[PDB]
């Protein structure tokens, strides 16, 4: 049997980066050379492994994480990076072993009056641990006085929308990202 990579890359809709989707992949023969040779990928960067020398490699579990971010934020999906996304949405460990794949999806994830479907976390007290995932929606308290569920001054909703308009610069355009974390052995 074949690994369900079509369900990952060719999926109709991706998740928001703060609620990034993880799908485990095991008990399947996988064709990787087709992925690297595909010119339909703006970004295909592997860490700890040669991309070509991949079909001849066995790993226990392969986790595929997919979400949507801005073009300018793709550089944060990498080991040892800081920023809104890496700190508060999706963190990769310094010792990450795997590949990061991205492609422009302006034709899919942008609507004329803006696409407010995709969100990201703007406020969080502390950084995410590697592969941690936070989907809470509690009002972020920026001052001493508590918020008690009422937004306002010093009382900010933590999630913000991208509003992908098709006229945005590429750096503000939606890119779909797929992160393949491998479980390598001896």
């Amino acid at each position: 049997n074949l690994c369900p990579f079509g369900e990952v890359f060719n999926a109709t809709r991706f998740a928001s980066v703060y609620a990034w989707n993880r799908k485990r992949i095991s008990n399947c023969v996988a064709d990787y050379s087709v992925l690297y040779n595909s010119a339909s990928f703006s970004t295909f960067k592997c860490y700890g492994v040669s991309p070509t020398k991949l079909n001849d490699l066995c790993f226990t579990n392969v986790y595929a994480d997919s979400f949507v971010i801005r073009g300018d934020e793709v550089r944060q999906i990498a080991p040892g990076q800081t920023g809104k996304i890496a700190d508060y949405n999706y963190k990769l460990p310094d010792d990450f072993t795997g590949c990061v794949i991205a492609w422009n999806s302006n034709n899919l994830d942008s609507k004329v009056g803006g696409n407010y479907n995709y969100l990201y976390r703007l406020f969080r007290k502390s950084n995410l641990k590697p592969f941690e995932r936070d989907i809470s929606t509690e009002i972020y308290q920026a001052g001493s006085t508590p918020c008690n569920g009422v937004e306002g001054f010093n009382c900010y909703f933590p999630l913000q929308s991208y509003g992908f308009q098709p006229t945005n610069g590429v750096g503000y355009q939606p890119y779909r990202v797929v992160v393949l974390s491998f479980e390598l052995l001896h």
Partner: antibody
Amino acid sequence: QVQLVESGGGLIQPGGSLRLSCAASGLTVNRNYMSWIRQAPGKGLEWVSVIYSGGSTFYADSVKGRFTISRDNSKNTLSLQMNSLRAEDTAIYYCARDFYEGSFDIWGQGTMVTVSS
Amino acid sequence: SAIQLTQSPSFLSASIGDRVTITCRASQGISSYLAWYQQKPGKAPKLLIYAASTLQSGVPSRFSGSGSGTEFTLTISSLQPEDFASYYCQQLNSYPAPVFGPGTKVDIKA
């Protein structure tokens, strides 16, 4: 009630160092995006540095490797360590809180940094 | 390949009651990611508008913003004596660093 108060500016020779402090009230520094923004006499606004609530810090290229931002959770304070100062660093320095993607709703009165010739 | 902001006009002088409009242009589409600030000389900037068209609390209603994408305007429907200042736009959610407009100075003559 809410305010930021800069301090520590002065007159310094080139290559000298200076350290600025921003005392907050009505607002918690380590829970906010806190940035330093400067304005050269007669010129425009130039963002300098920011520190995230999570602790990440970022700098403008013109100050990278010479300026260091920090905070004091104990005294609810923001600091800017300015080293190897140059004439183009002469400016009024403001600390401000970002509440939405760069929107600085709260500012301090500033503090004046002058780098003599 | 970074985004740059231009602000026009650079300087303008008007009279009390005048309707003043200031333009900010982005070199690439940035949706509604913009803020407007007023800076009187010797004072700290004051936030007027954020997200292109959201009026800051306490800011008089005669100030308003509009535009989305590349063209943004600030509008003072009826200029007041205290309204003389420079005015800055700012690219919000900007990478790698926040960008400020070059500023628009507003004077007041007879």
